[PDB]
Amino acid sequence: ATFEIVNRCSYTVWAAASKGDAALDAGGRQLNSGESWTINVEPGTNGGKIWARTDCYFDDSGSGICKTGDCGGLLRCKRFGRPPTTLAEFSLNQYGKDYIDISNIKGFNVPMDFSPTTRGCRGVRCAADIVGQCPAKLKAPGGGCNDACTVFQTSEYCCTTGKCGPTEYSRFFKRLCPDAFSYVLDKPTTVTCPGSSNYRVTFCPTA
């Protein structure tokens, strides 16, 4: 599958793509405002994620740091990033279908649209000003709006026991972005697409 990753933000982001134990394609790249990066994701990929990182500094060897979404200090991510990170999530060619969603379960840093570029399904978007409206206790200093599990580490926020309900914090994310997951047991906002669809992820889609 092809993913086109587009930065429509007015600021530079460092895109990342991983399935947790490996990079997808190159794993990461700088995107200046307006730039597009096309990657190829192997069919059958389960549990892939794409996200943006902000305020990064990398040396010539691809080693450094980012204020949101850092993946162990690497430009080319092999593992998932540090919250807060708005997440585009996908599993491809699962018994004939692709499944896509946007998630705020690991917080929010950059607004996002995640849409197919081929026919057969709809896209999803979370483009509200979650950072500006973020509750005081969830605000991240480096930028972004943390999820409550990251901040407080309780069974209820992290849904550790497999039983949990919505919370005042999850409802905040859900109010501003109804089409994104707001906690682990949220009513699913997953979209089912034809197997082997292609996609575009746009950062700051309403910019």
PDB file of C-alpha atoms in Angstrom:
ATOM      1  CA  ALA A   1       0.000   0.000   0.000  1.00  0.00           C
ATOM      2  CA  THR A   2       0.980   3.560  -0.663  1.00  0.00           C
ATOM      3  CA  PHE A   3       0.685   6.285   1.977  1.00  0.00           C
ATOM      4  CA  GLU A   4       1.211   9.905   1.070  1.00  0.00           C
ATOM      5  CA  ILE A   5       2.104  11.936   4.150  1.00  0.00           C
ATOM      6  CA  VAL A   6       1.542  15.673   3.719  1.00  0.00           C
ATOM      7  CA  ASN A   7       2.518  18.473   6.060  1.00  0.00           C
ATOM      8  CA  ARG A   8       0.050  21.334   5.649  1.00  0.00           C
ATOM      9  CA  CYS A   9       1.156  22.859   8.985  1.00  0.00           C
ATOM     10  CA  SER A  10       2.958  26.206   8.901  1.00  0.00           C
ATOM     11  CA  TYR A  11       5.745  24.626  10.950  1.00  0.00           C
ATOM     12  CA  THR A  12       8.151  21.769  10.218  1.00  0.00           C
ATOM     13  CA  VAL A  13       7.236  18.314  11.488  1.00  0.00           C
ATOM     14  CA  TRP A  14       9.199  15.088  11.511  1.00  0.00           C
ATOM     15  CA  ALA A  15       6.891  12.349  10.301  1.00  0.00           C
ATOM     16  CA  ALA A  16       7.280   8.856  11.713  1.00  0.00           C
ATOM     17  CA  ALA A  17       5.983   5.453  10.636  1.00  0.00           C
ATOM     18  CA  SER A  18       6.410   2.237  12.627  1.00  0.00           C
ATOM     19  CA  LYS A  19       4.706  -1.013  13.536  1.00  0.00           C
ATOM     20  CA  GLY A  20       6.267  -1.042  16.991  1.00  0.00           C
ATOM     21  CA  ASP A  21       9.117  -3.474  16.427  1.00  0.00           C
ATOM     22  CA  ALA A  22      10.241  -2.144  13.051  1.00  0.00           C
ATOM     23  CA  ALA A  23      10.233   0.915  10.838  1.00  0.00           C
ATOM     24  CA  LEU A  24       7.729   1.194   8.016  1.00  0.00           C
ATOM     25  CA  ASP A  25       9.642   2.272   4.913  1.00  0.00           C
ATOM     26  CA  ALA A  26      12.397   4.663   6.061  1.00  0.00           C
ATOM     27  CA  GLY A  27      10.657   5.143   9.431  1.00  0.00           C
ATOM     28  CA  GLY A  28      10.906   8.921   9.563  1.00  0.00           C
ATOM     29  CA  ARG A  29      11.660  12.093   7.672  1.00  0.00           C
ATOM     30  CA  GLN A  30      11.640  15.848   8.002  1.00  0.00           C
ATOM     31  CA  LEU A  31       8.667  17.541   6.311  1.00  0.00           C
ATOM     32  CA  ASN A  32       8.846  21.275   5.869  1.00  0.00           C
ATOM     33  CA  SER A  33       5.588  23.152   5.444  1.00  0.00           C
ATOM     34  CA  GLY A  34       3.914  21.904   2.275  1.00  0.00           C
ATOM     35  CA  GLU A  35       6.154  18.874   1.716  1.00  0.00           C
ATOM     36  CA  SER A  36       4.849  15.412   0.851  1.00  0.00           C
ATOM     37  CA  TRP A  37       6.466  12.055   1.596  1.00  0.00           C
ATOM     38  CA  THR A  38       5.331   8.892  -0.154  1.00  0.00           C
ATOM     39  CA  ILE A  39       5.969   5.596   1.604  1.00  0.00           C
ATOM     40  CA  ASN A  40       5.251   1.979   0.798  1.00  0.00           C
ATOM     41  CA  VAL A  41       3.775  -0.233   3.494  1.00  0.00           C
ATOM     42  CA  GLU A  42       3.830  -4.003   3.022  1.00  0.00           C
ATOM     43  CA  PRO A  43       0.460  -5.717   2.558  1.00  0.00           C
ATOM     44  CA  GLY A  44      -0.691  -7.528   5.681  1.00  0.00           C
ATOM     45  CA  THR A  45       0.901  -5.002   8.022  1.00  0.00           C
ATOM     46  CA  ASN A  46      -0.885  -5.198  11.352  1.00  0.00           C
ATOM     47  CA  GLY A  47      -0.760  -2.447  13.946  1.00  0.00           C
ATOM     48  CA  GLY A  48       1.025   0.232  11.942  1.00  0.00           C
ATOM     49  CA  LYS A  49       1.028   3.844  13.122  1.00  0.00           C
ATOM     50  CA  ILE A  50       1.935   7.198  11.591  1.00  0.00           C
ATOM     51  CA  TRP A  51       2.464  10.325  13.675  1.00  0.00           C
ATOM     52  CA  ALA A  52       4.137  13.732  13.656  1.00  0.00           C
ATOM     53  CA  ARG A  53       6.976  14.841  15.907  1.00  0.00           C
ATOM     54  CA  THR A  54       7.566  18.483  16.770  1.00  0.00           C
ATOM     55  CA  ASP A  55      10.606  20.567  17.718  1.00  0.00           C
ATOM     56  CA  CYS A  56      13.263  18.034  16.800  1.00  0.00           C
ATOM     57  CA  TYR A  57      17.050  18.355  16.666  1.00  0.00           C
ATOM     58  CA  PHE A  58      19.036  15.651  14.855  1.00  0.00           C
ATOM     59  CA  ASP A  59      22.732  15.406  14.113  1.00  0.00           C
ATOM     60  CA  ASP A  60      24.235  14.081  10.872  1.00  0.00           C
ATOM     61  CA  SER A  61      23.901  10.492  12.120  1.00  0.00           C
ATOM     62  CA  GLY A  62      20.133  10.758  12.629  1.00  0.00           C
ATOM     63  CA  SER A  63      20.351  10.900  16.422  1.00  0.00           C
ATOM     64  CA  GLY A  64      18.728  13.557  18.589  1.00  0.00           C
ATOM     65  CA  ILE A  65      15.544  14.510  20.352  1.00  0.00           C
ATOM     66  CA  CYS A  66      11.996  15.775  19.756  1.00  0.00           C
ATOM     67  CA  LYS A  67       9.618  17.497  22.176  1.00  0.00           C
ATOM     68  CA  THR A  68       6.656  15.375  21.143  1.00  0.00           C
ATOM     69  CA  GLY A  69       6.620  11.887  19.712  1.00  0.00           C
ATOM     70  CA  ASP A  70      10.305  11.087  20.196  1.00  0.00           C
ATOM     71  CA  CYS A  71      11.107   7.473  19.274  1.00  0.00           C
ATOM     72  CA  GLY A  72      14.218   6.729  21.304  1.00  0.00           C
ATOM     73  CA  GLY A  73      16.126   9.669  19.863  1.00  0.00           C
ATOM     74  CA  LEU A  74      16.143   8.473  16.245  1.00  0.00           C
ATOM     75  CA  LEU A  75      15.172  10.268  13.060  1.00  0.00           C
ATOM     76  CA  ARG A  76      14.161   6.957  11.489  1.00  0.00           C
ATOM     77  CA  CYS A  77      11.764   5.397  14.006  1.00  0.00           C
ATOM     78  CA  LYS A  78      11.803   1.685  14.716  1.00  0.00           C
ATOM     79  CA  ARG A  79       9.546   1.944  17.762  1.00  0.00           C
ATOM     80  CA  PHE A  80       6.507   3.994  18.774  1.00  0.00           C
ATOM     81  CA  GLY A  81       6.838   7.572  19.973  1.00  0.00           C
ATOM     82  CA  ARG A  82       6.567   9.242  23.346  1.00  0.00           C
ATOM     83  CA  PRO A  83       3.184  10.850  24.092  1.00  0.00           C
ATOM     84  CA  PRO A  84       1.592  13.194  23.362  1.00  0.00           C
ATOM     85  CA  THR A  85       1.014  11.955  19.818  1.00  0.00           C
ATOM     86  CA  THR A  86      -2.073  12.113  17.625  1.00  0.00           C
ATOM     87  CA  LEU A  87      -2.077   8.674  15.968  1.00  0.00           C
ATOM     88  CA  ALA A  88      -3.079   7.422  12.550  1.00  0.00           C
ATOM     89  CA  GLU A  89      -3.539   3.655  13.042  1.00  0.00           C
ATOM     90  CA  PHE A  90      -4.013   0.929  10.482  1.00  0.00           C
ATOM     91  CA  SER A  91      -4.107  -2.778   9.869  1.00  0.00           C
ATOM     92  CA  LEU A  92      -3.999  -3.868   6.236  1.00  0.00           C
ATOM     93  CA  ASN A  93      -5.343  -6.926   4.420  1.00  0.00           C
ATOM     94  CA  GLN A  94      -7.020  -8.467   7.433  1.00  0.00           C
ATOM     95  CA  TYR A  95      -9.261 -11.137   5.942  1.00  0.00           C
ATOM     96  CA  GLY A  96      -9.875  -9.003   2.871  1.00  0.00           C
ATOM     97  CA  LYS A  97     -10.318  -5.619   4.545  1.00  0.00           C
ATOM     98  CA  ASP A  98      -8.248  -2.660   5.722  1.00  0.00           C
ATOM     99  CA  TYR A  99      -9.011  -1.000   9.067  1.00  0.00           C
ATOM    100  CA  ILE A 100      -8.090   2.607   9.818  1.00  0.00           C
ATOM    101  CA  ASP A 101      -8.653   5.013  12.698  1.00  0.00           C
ATOM    102  CA  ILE A 102      -7.360   8.093  14.441  1.00  0.00           C
ATOM    103  CA  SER A 103      -6.627   7.805  18.150  1.00  0.00           C
ATOM    104  CA  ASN A 104      -6.160  10.267  21.010  1.00  0.00           C
ATOM    105  CA  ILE A 105      -5.467   7.455  23.493  1.00  0.00           C
ATOM    106  CA  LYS A 106      -1.813   8.589  23.613  1.00  0.00           C
ATOM    107  CA  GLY A 107      -2.746  12.267  23.610  1.00  0.00           C
ATOM    108  CA  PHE A 108      -2.719  14.906  20.894  1.00  0.00           C
ATOM    109  CA  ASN A 109       0.051  17.030  19.410  1.00  0.00           C
ATOM    110  CA  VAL A 110      -0.842  17.889  15.788  1.00  0.00           C
ATOM    111  CA  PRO A 111      -4.227  17.936  14.008  1.00  0.00           C
ATOM    112  CA  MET A 112      -4.709  15.195  11.439  1.00  0.00           C
ATOM    113  CA  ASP A 113      -6.812  13.922   8.553  1.00  0.00           C
ATOM    114  CA  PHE A 114      -6.503  10.248   7.540  1.00  0.00           C
ATOM    115  CA  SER A 115      -8.277   9.468   4.267  1.00  0.00           C
ATOM    116  CA  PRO A 116      -8.242   6.852   1.526  1.00  0.00           C
ATOM    117  CA  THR A 117      -7.042   7.979  -1.913  1.00  0.00           C
ATOM    118  CA  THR A 118      -8.843   5.042  -3.516  1.00  0.00           C
ATOM    119  CA  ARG A 119     -12.604   4.414  -3.490  1.00  0.00           C
ATOM    120  CA  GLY A 120     -14.741   2.417  -1.078  1.00  0.00           C
ATOM    121  CA  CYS A 121     -14.691   4.146   2.313  1.00  0.00           C
ATOM    122  CA  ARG A 122     -14.572   7.485   4.109  1.00  0.00           C
ATOM    123  CA  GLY A 123     -11.788   9.237   5.969  1.00  0.00           C
ATOM    124  CA  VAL A 124     -11.559  10.430   9.551  1.00  0.00           C
ATOM    125  CA  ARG A 125     -10.263  13.661  11.018  1.00  0.00           C
ATOM    126  CA  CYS A 126      -9.309  15.252  14.319  1.00  0.00           C
ATOM    127  CA  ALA A 127      -8.614  18.915  13.641  1.00  0.00           C
ATOM    128  CA  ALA A 128      -9.923  20.794  16.664  1.00  0.00           C
ATOM    129  CA  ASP A 129      -7.659  23.001  18.791  1.00  0.00           C
ATOM    130  CA  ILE A 130      -7.070  20.389  21.453  1.00  0.00           C
ATOM    131  CA  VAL A 131      -3.760  21.902  22.544  1.00  0.00           C
ATOM    132  CA  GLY A 132      -5.302  25.356  23.097  1.00  0.00           C
ATOM    133  CA  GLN A 133      -8.254  23.981  25.052  1.00  0.00           C
ATOM    134  CA  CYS A 134      -6.282  21.280  26.923  1.00  0.00           C
ATOM    135  CA  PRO A 135      -7.149  20.937  30.637  1.00  0.00           C
ATOM    136  CA  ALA A 136      -4.385  22.344  32.836  1.00  0.00           C
ATOM    137  CA  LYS A 137      -3.406  19.003  34.345  1.00  0.00           C
ATOM    138  CA  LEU A 138      -2.962  17.405  30.896  1.00  0.00           C
ATOM    139  CA  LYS A 139      -0.868  20.140  29.302  1.00  0.00           C
ATOM    140  CA  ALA A 140       2.588  18.996  28.226  1.00  0.00           C
ATOM    141  CA  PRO A 141       5.383  21.591  28.691  1.00  0.00           C
ATOM    142  CA  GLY A 142       7.140  20.624  25.467  1.00  0.00           C
ATOM    143  CA  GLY A 143       3.833  21.030  23.701  1.00  0.00           C
ATOM    144  CA  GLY A 144       0.730  18.945  23.223  1.00  0.00           C
ATOM    145  CA  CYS A 145      -2.055  17.577  25.376  1.00  0.00           C
ATOM    146  CA  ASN A 146      -1.358  14.348  27.242  1.00  0.00           C
ATOM    147  CA  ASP A 147      -3.867  11.594  27.788  1.00  0.00           C
ATOM    148  CA  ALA A 148      -4.847  10.881  31.396  1.00  0.00           C
ATOM    149  CA  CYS A 149      -3.200   7.438  31.478  1.00  0.00           C
ATOM    150  CA  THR A 150       0.195   8.926  30.642  1.00  0.00           C
ATOM    151  CA  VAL A 151      -0.204  11.610  33.315  1.00  0.00           C
ATOM    152  CA  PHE A 152      -1.800   9.746  36.238  1.00  0.00           C
ATOM    153  CA  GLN A 153      -1.003   6.045  35.654  1.00  0.00           C
ATOM    154  CA  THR A 154      -4.204   4.658  37.197  1.00  0.00           C
ATOM    155  CA  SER A 155      -6.026   1.453  36.344  1.00  0.00           C
ATOM    156  CA  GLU A 156      -9.102   3.484  35.380  1.00  0.00           C
ATOM    157  CA  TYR A 157      -7.380   5.807  32.882  1.00  0.00           C
ATOM    158  CA  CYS A 158      -5.160   3.061  31.461  1.00  0.00           C
ATOM    159  CA  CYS A 159      -7.985   0.477  31.454  1.00  0.00           C
ATOM    160  CA  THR A 160      -5.566  -2.030  32.921  1.00  0.00           C
ATOM    161  CA  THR A 161      -8.179  -4.533  34.143  1.00  0.00           C
ATOM    162  CA  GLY A 162     -10.037  -4.459  30.830  1.00  0.00           C
ATOM    163  CA  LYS A 163     -12.866  -2.679  32.568  1.00  0.00           C
ATOM    164  CA  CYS A 164     -13.003   1.078  32.632  1.00  0.00           C
ATOM    165  CA  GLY A 165     -15.431   3.829  31.766  1.00  0.00           C
ATOM    166  CA  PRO A 166     -15.188   7.235  30.144  1.00  0.00           C
ATOM    167  CA  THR A 167     -13.721   9.927  32.373  1.00  0.00           C
ATOM    168  CA  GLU A 168     -13.755  13.717  32.581  1.00  0.00           C
ATOM    169  CA  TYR A 169     -10.468  13.672  30.683  1.00  0.00           C
ATOM    170  CA  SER A 170     -11.538  11.243  27.949  1.00  0.00           C
ATOM    171  CA  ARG A 171     -14.761  13.200  27.438  1.00  0.00           C
ATOM    172  CA  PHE A 172     -12.684  16.313  26.723  1.00  0.00           C
ATOM    173  CA  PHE A 173     -10.947  14.606  23.790  1.00  0.00           C
ATOM    174  CA  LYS A 174     -14.236  13.081  22.617  1.00  0.00           C
ATOM    175  CA  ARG A 175     -16.076  16.412  22.668  1.00  0.00           C
ATOM    176  CA  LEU A 176     -13.468  18.064  20.454  1.00  0.00           C
ATOM    177  CA  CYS A 177     -12.884  15.017  18.215  1.00  0.00           C
ATOM    178  CA  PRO A 178     -15.815  12.593  18.169  1.00  0.00           C
ATOM    179  CA  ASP A 179     -14.330  10.526  15.356  1.00  0.00           C
ATOM    180  CA  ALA A 180     -11.152   9.605  17.264  1.00  0.00           C
ATOM    181  CA  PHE A 181     -10.670   7.047  20.044  1.00  0.00           C
ATOM    182  CA  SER A 182     -10.664   8.865  23.396  1.00  0.00           C
ATOM    183  CA  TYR A 183      -9.989   5.937  25.756  1.00  0.00           C
ATOM    184  CA  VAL A 184      -9.261   2.233  25.398  1.00  0.00           C
ATOM    185  CA  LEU A 185     -12.870   1.000  25.509  1.00  0.00           C
ATOM    186  CA  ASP A 186     -14.397   3.845  23.544  1.00  0.00           C
ATOM    187  CA  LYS A 187     -17.092   2.862  21.056  1.00  0.00           C
ATOM    188  CA  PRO A 188     -14.954   2.075  18.002  1.00  0.00           C
ATOM    189  CA  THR A 189     -14.549   4.764  15.358  1.00  0.00           C
ATOM    190  CA  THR A 190     -12.656   2.393  13.088  1.00  0.00           C
ATOM    191  CA  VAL A 191     -13.374   2.635   9.370  1.00  0.00           C
ATOM    192  CA  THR A 192     -13.459  -0.467   7.194  1.00  0.00           C
ATOM    193  CA  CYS A 193     -11.908  -0.038   3.741  1.00  0.00           C
ATOM    194  CA  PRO A 194     -11.391  -2.451   0.850  1.00  0.00           C
ATOM    195  CA  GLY A 195      -8.232  -4.529   1.248  1.00  0.00           C
ATOM    196  CA  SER A 196      -5.193  -2.947  -0.440  1.00  0.00           C
ATOM    197  CA  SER A 197      -6.521   0.618  -0.385  1.00  0.00           C
ATOM    198  CA  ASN A 198      -4.101   3.565  -0.539  1.00  0.00           C
ATOM    199  CA  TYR A 199      -4.128   6.510   1.847  1.00  0.00           C
ATOM    200  CA  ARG A 200      -3.148  10.075   2.600  1.00  0.00           C
ATOM    201  CA  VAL A 201      -2.289  11.399   6.051  1.00  0.00           C
ATOM    202  CA  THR A 202      -2.444  15.201   6.215  1.00  0.00           C
ATOM    203  CA  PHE A 203      -1.086  17.137   9.175  1.00  0.00           C
ATOM    204  CA  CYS A 204      -2.976  20.393   9.871  1.00  0.00           C
ATOM    205  CA  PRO A 205      -5.676  19.674   7.284  1.00  0.00           C
ATOM    206  CA  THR A 206      -7.562  22.925   7.892  1.00  0.00           C
ATOM    207  CA  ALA A 207      -4.424  25.097   7.787  1.00  0.00           C
TER     208      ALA A 207
END
